[PDB]
């Protein structure tokens, strides 16, 4: 039993979007489908529920004319359509299978991240972070700045099997995201062995590699 949702979406304010939820492994028509909104990782807001067998809907009064729930019994797929989108609607939306009375939401899709903004897709600018003190270990980093939208994936490749890596959440400055990633390796490995940060931005279809160099 698993639910797959459509990929992330960047949309202009005022426009609409339609999220899909492909069920599998169970009788799609026998279990209701609920939709949940999670704004910036905090609380959970219940949007509505649909009966896939009968197609009858029940919406949260806060989401009457914001969300429209439909279903395709043919392809065992639930749908949620969001209209008149604003920055307030930018969030992660989940479809969760209603397991029945006194059973709760017993299955959740991976979620879909929608972004409502006027900013255009921009690839990242990557800058190396190398030390210009001598100690036991060495910490390096890469600064990812000027990209949009989220997210990005930084992967380090060094000549050492130990990698104290830290990924810092992105912060929004000048209407564009900025991220930092750090790595800690033994001193005897760098710069005696190449260290590279691989920044992947799928939204712009760009992967940038930076070899860290001494100063």
């Amino acid at each position: 039993f698993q639910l797959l949702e459509s990929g992330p979406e960047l949309v202009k304010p005022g426009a609409s979007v339609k999220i899909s939820c492909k069920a599998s492994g169970y009788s799609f028509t026998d279990y209701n489908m609920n939709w949940v909104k999670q704004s910036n990782g905090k609380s959970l807001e219940w949007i509505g529920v649909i009966n896939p067998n009968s197609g009858t809907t029940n919406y949260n009064q806060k989401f009457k004319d914001k969300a429209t729930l439909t279903v395709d019994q043919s392809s065992s797929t639930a749908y949620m359509q969001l209209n008149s989108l604003t920055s307030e609607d930018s969030a992660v939306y989940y479809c969760a299978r209603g397991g029945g009375f006194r059973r709760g939401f017993d299955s959740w899709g991976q979620g879909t991240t929608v972004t409502v903004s006027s900013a255009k897709t921009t690839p990242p600018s990557v800058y190396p972070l190398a030390p210009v003190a001598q100690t036991n270990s060495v910490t390096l980093g890469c600064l990812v700045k000027g990209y949009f939208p989220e997210p990005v994936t930084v992967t380090w490749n060094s000549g050492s099997l130990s990698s104290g890596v830290h990924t810092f959440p992105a912060v929004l400055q000048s209407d564009l995201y900025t991220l930092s990633s750090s790595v800690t390796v033994p001193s005897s490995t760098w710069p005696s062995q190449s260290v590279t940060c691989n920044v992947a931005h799928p939204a712009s279809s760009t992967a940038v590699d930076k070899k860290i160099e001494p100063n």
């Binding site: 006194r102 059973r103 600018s125 210009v132 910490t139 600064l143 959440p169 750090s182």
Partner: protein, 211 residues
Amino acid sequence: QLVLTQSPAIMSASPGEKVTMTCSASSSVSYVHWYQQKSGTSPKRWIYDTSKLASGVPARFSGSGSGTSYSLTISSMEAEDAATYYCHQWRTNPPTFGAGTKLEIKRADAAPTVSIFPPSSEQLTSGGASVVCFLNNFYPKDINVKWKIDGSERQNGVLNSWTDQDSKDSTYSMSSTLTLTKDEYERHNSYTCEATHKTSTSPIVKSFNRN
């Protein structure tokens, strides 16, 4: 609607320590559901019908309550349980969730390993100059940082970002980025990163000079 209030909002606990978190209802209900969520993933049904444990959840967990008072209990905390937990009710339309109880794991304190990085010549040639300061591996989360130029303090033009509790050593980390243009960085020479943490009264200081 019917409001759910979870307490505490955030808490810590050591391995083997017993944990309990409450879910209060603005009016009497008959049962609640508990959902576990870890960073960057979807909520999972953890406990349903107040007391029933889902498939594959450890026996350490348990749930009880009635009316307006409900609670989730862990007999012996483990690192696997560090996550946020929401309660859920549907006694009346619409259903509601609690604000959540972020359950972190407790460990011994640690001082932050600090490292400063000047603007790369690459960024300089692009009309920018960002100086970075990594405050890695410290506990607890609470920390403060300040930037100084030749001894003079500089507020704002700074961004800070905290990482979630690391899954391997249960520590925290934060990055501090003082962003300038080029000539704004070209005036002064010495740039200093000063960090203040609960562990020590004296701040941890790393710095550099342009030349």
